[PDB]
Design a binder for this molecule. Sequence first.
Ligand SMILES: CCCCCCCCCCCCCCCCCC(=O)OC[C@H](COP(=O)(O)OCCN)OC(=O)CCCCCCCCCCCCCCCCC
Ligand SMILES: Nc1nc2c(ncn2[C@@H]2O[C@H](COP(=O)(O)OP(=O)(O)OP(=O)(O)O)[C@@H](O)[C@H]2O)c(=O)[nH]1
Ligand SMILES: [Mg+2]
Lengths: 347, 64, 98, 49, 175, 70, 320, 120, 55
Amino acid sequence: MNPIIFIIILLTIMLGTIIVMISSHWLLVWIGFEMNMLAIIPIMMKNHNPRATEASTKYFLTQSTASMLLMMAVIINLMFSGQWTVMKLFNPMASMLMTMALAMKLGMAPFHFWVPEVTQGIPLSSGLILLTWQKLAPMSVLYQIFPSINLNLILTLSVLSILIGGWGGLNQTQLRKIMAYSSIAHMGWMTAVLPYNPTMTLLNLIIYIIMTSTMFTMFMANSTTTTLSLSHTWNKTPIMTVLILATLLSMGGLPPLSGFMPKWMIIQEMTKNNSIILPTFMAITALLNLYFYMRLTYSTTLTMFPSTNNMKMKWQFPLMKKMTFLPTMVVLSTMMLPLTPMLSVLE
Amino acid sequence: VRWTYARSANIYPNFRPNTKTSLLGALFGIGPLVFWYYVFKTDRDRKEKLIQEGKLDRTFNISY
Amino acid sequence: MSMVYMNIMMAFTVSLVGLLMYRSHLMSSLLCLEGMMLSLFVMAALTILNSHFTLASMMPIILLVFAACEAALGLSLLVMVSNTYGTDYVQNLNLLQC
Amino acid sequence: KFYIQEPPHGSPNWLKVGLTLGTSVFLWIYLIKQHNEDVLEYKRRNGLE
Amino acid sequence: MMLYIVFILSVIFVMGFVGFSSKPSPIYGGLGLIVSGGVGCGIVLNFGGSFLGLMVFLIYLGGMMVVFGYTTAMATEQYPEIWLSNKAVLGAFVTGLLMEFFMVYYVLKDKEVEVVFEFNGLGDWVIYDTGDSGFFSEEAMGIAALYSYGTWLVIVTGWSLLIGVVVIMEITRGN
Amino acid sequence: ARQWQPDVEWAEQYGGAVMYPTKETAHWKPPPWNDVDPPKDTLVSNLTLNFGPQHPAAHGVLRLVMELSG
Amino acid sequence: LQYGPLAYILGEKATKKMTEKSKLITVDGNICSGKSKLAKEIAEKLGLKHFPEAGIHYVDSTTGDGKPLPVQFSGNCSLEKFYDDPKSNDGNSYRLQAWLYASRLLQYADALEHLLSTGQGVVLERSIYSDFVFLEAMYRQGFIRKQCVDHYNQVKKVTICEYLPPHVVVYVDVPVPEVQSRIQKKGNPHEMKITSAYLQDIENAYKGTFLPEMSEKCEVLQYSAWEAQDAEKVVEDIEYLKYDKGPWLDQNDRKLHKLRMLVQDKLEVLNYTSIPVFLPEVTVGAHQSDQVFQEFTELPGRKYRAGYNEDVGDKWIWLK
Amino acid sequence: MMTGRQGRATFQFLPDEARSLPPPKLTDPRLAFVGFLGYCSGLIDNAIRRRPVLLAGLHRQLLYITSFVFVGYYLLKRQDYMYAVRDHDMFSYIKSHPEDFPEKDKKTYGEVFEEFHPVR
Amino acid sequence: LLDLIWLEAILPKTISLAQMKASTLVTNQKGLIKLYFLSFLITILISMILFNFHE
Ligand SMILES: CCCCCCCCCCCCCCCCCC(=O)OC[C@H](COP(=O)(O)OCCN)OC(=O)CCCCCCCCCCCCCCCCC
Ligand SMILES: Nc1nc2c(ncn2[C@@H]2O[C@H](COP(=O)(O)OP(=O)(O)OP(=O)(O)O)[C@@H](O)[C@H]2O)c(=O)[nH]1
Ligand SMILES: [Mg+2]
């Protein structure tokens, strides 16, 4: 792509999301999703290969179906309330349709199948946009309609997402597929707490984005997309293996790292509402994710896998990728737990 | 090396749950626990019953 | 509700089932997607016109414009798929299985 | 001269160095100024001496 | 029977949908959608949406569907399988018309049916407005207001269409 | 002795398509190193046209075997 | 300004720098074919930059102080040991070929970066495009296993697809008996052990595979040993080529910006030369590679990024 | 829960009523920790780019510390404002609904009966 | 009998074995658009008929 056109397309992806986030009108929310989908397809197609074309097609079909269901919910809401204001919906059928539409857009289980495939089929930079920025608009909508959401439906989607994400990631060797299932699992935490305290949905979203952004950036720095290609990092950039280790432990939710904070604060809110079984089940099931994060740390940082002779040639050249914000992101991904009370700025 | 390996690491791979292993494990594993539970639970219930009725001698029993 | 809504809502349901139950041609599924938009356009227009919601009269046009633009994007992807494989069959789009 | 090819970071980028140090000074001066006025306004509103 | 023109049209509307939703060869799928679109415009006209109805013909049928048929010819179909000559296509078509027939049967007989929502079968005319004597078309006034009230809508809609041109050129270049 | 570190046999456990092979994933293979699959399906874009004159009133006896590209 | 998208937007576009003289020329031929002598002659007459053939230590010559590094930092690849013992069970034969392919791949990216950044043409002696003739010759003599050939083809497949071929391929044709005579004259004890079977397989690969393939996309010029002596005629022929085939005609500023972004980043160039395919010839255990890597960083000017090494006289490090 | 506060000046980082609160002290231990995180980010930046970790680019390290401390100061001001608002809302509600928060008539342990469970 | 066998079988070994089996069920998919969207239809139908999420 012409670099100027690439900038305009990224700004349009952001504009679509911003429109969703500032709109008080359901039509403008729908337009924001349409604009966002239109602008993201080129960045998925940009490397021109059959896998990128398949991923773009699978993504287009999923998102277009979701957006039609969203519009159906809006129109039903208009028929039963005569207004367009972005707020609680006034019909239970409209609520179910919009909740399902947003679950499809988020890739929540059982609407999840596209996330692993689409992420695998596109470049790492595109996957970073797909798994971080693309969650902002659907979450911002769920944040505003949650009082009218069916409690059983949203909690069912959350439980399934945590289960499927945890189990799906166990069988993966591709880094992009691991991040896709990790995203699905982390999605379930955000929606599980939404009925009780939407502020903790925002907290988990922000910290998830920071950690996911850190992981993709480090994968991009060495152009690694598989477990075995990442296992060579120790013999090229040792510092990167330590940073990868810290972030993976943080994503695993281990104290005293930053990733424990969202799990800690969500458990607190659910227990205040006499929800004991569900947070206990969620916390235990999250051990699945810790397992396949720990497997990566074993092959990357805590042991030394075999290298190749041609790796010696790489020693003579410096890293020249930008790695934008990486030093800041990795610190925020790991060392923020002592500042947990700062979550009140999200209130 | 073969001897120490056979006495540890090689055991579980060659284990099969069947009638012999299941029964012995239940008999040696759970058996003693159930037995000792009923010995102490019985003894303590009897002793507790006597203390509530003042029928157990604890005249100089002040260390516990 | 009035009787007409029953049929418009059936049409959306029918085209949604048609969208979710693929055969082979990717083109046949895109038509079901456009069918969904047509039924939304009609139901929106009927609700807005009957209620005399004057400023909402422009909403069906915006719906049609944005949905046609999204249909152009869908057709472009179909052409790129047909270039890769020579057909628009969805069973050739299974590389990402692994 | 040791390097066969001149490194991109052979010598300081004196423009960046100047803009880096100036930015730090600006933020520090601005932060101190902000803090002093917040303390003054906090005292005025609470009628404190 | 002319007093149920809207309902009769909506029955044809559903039948056309069952047409292309059973997904025969794309060539005939486009035909079902074209007929449904034309019937759809007819329903909108009978509610006082003359401009909206004609937009369907001009933009949906004369624009979008022409391009679909154009693309189908080049990239998809050149000759079709006979309509309803396939087991699944015919079974889906029969199933749809049976469901439509029964919905129509009960709504007309009991004057009311109930599936997700409650529907009344008195006739769509009963809900119409009984006061009309302005010297203009309310629909046209609302659409004309796009340029006065809807500045923000024009900007984002205009931006999306421009980005559509850019994006589609990117997608189809192939390198 | 020296600390054990993974050998090729250990490392190859993580190089398959999946972590836990099954009968239903036996045919699965790792994707291309650079994500590019070879274009082997259909690429036949050159028309061959036996060309004559629109009206045979003047030429009549011209046969032109042309190969076109768009 | 370091080249990048912003420099491109500010007018740094390859079509400005390049002219009809901005050509990439490779000279090929068998061992002792005189290709090197001609290549220097072509480069001088046409005013092109000459690149001596990439050997084992080509990468050393572009980094650090430019001097060759000890052999253990090339994996102990030895051309001499390939001639003394081509079937050694230590894997030297394929380990050498894999290292040389990466060296040529690096040199080719260096040639493109020079051509695209400055607009001046370049002359290479062999390239990544003809490197495979040596692989076929090794394989047919039984010096390497068929698994080694598969590894080479896997690496070549995902690396060569990213580059443009040369504008001109100059082949110097010398029969094997004459090549064998010329090797004896040159008086290299290890090179004298080359067999005619090995030299013949190189020739067969050049003529059966290389030249037919490059003819479809490059301007191929062939010369006998005697004709190649007249560089004036060779240069004359190059100047009157039409240049009407090949992917270079389908290039614009946008596509050359993407190419330049690649060839400038040498780690992105070499990314796939170290794919995790565990072939014994090229696989190094962690203990060895850990040991050698630590010794590499202990070399002068190697501990830190270039320009941050006090031990070689870098200054102002606290402000860089 | 506090999204629709009656006195919520919407989409304002620090509404004007926040100016009645004492500012965070520049010696606040949380602000010192934020500065430390900035210093760690500076060291990591050197490490990933293979510069001498402690000495390289002291100007860059200083801007890491300043920017973290600068942003940290305002985030703490908002943090303290949001907890002040929470307490203000809580106490106002308790006053407005005395029937829901009655002062208990609370007895001494001499009067309240607690069962004894012997440990024997 | 106890330490190396049954105390492994009743907890870590069996729990680990079940997760592995569940993982292969989740990830043994054919990558077919047709089947994935067919499962969406089942999800929507179940959500209404069985769980009445639309109410
Ligand atoms: C004026 C120029 C413009 C730039 C000015 C900016 C300066 C501030 C930026 C931060 C830099 C701090 C100073 C760093 C000094 C590093 C000097 C150095 O690298 O020399 C190494 C020195 C001695 O080591 P040596 O004996 O030579 O060799 C030992 C072999 N193992 O080893 C040392 O003694 C180094 C000691 C460690 C460095 C100090 C650690 C500072 C910690 C900061 C905590 C941040 C807290 C922020 C809180 C703020 C809240 C308001
Ligand atoms: N195994 C192997 N040896 C190579 C390769 N490239 C060069 N060599 C060896 O490097 C030595 C010198 O290469 P040549 O250029 O062909 O020999 P030369 O004497 O310089 O011949 P001219 O330059 O044409 O005059 C020869 O002994 C080659 O066998 C290679 O890709 N693989
Ligand atoms: Mg030579």
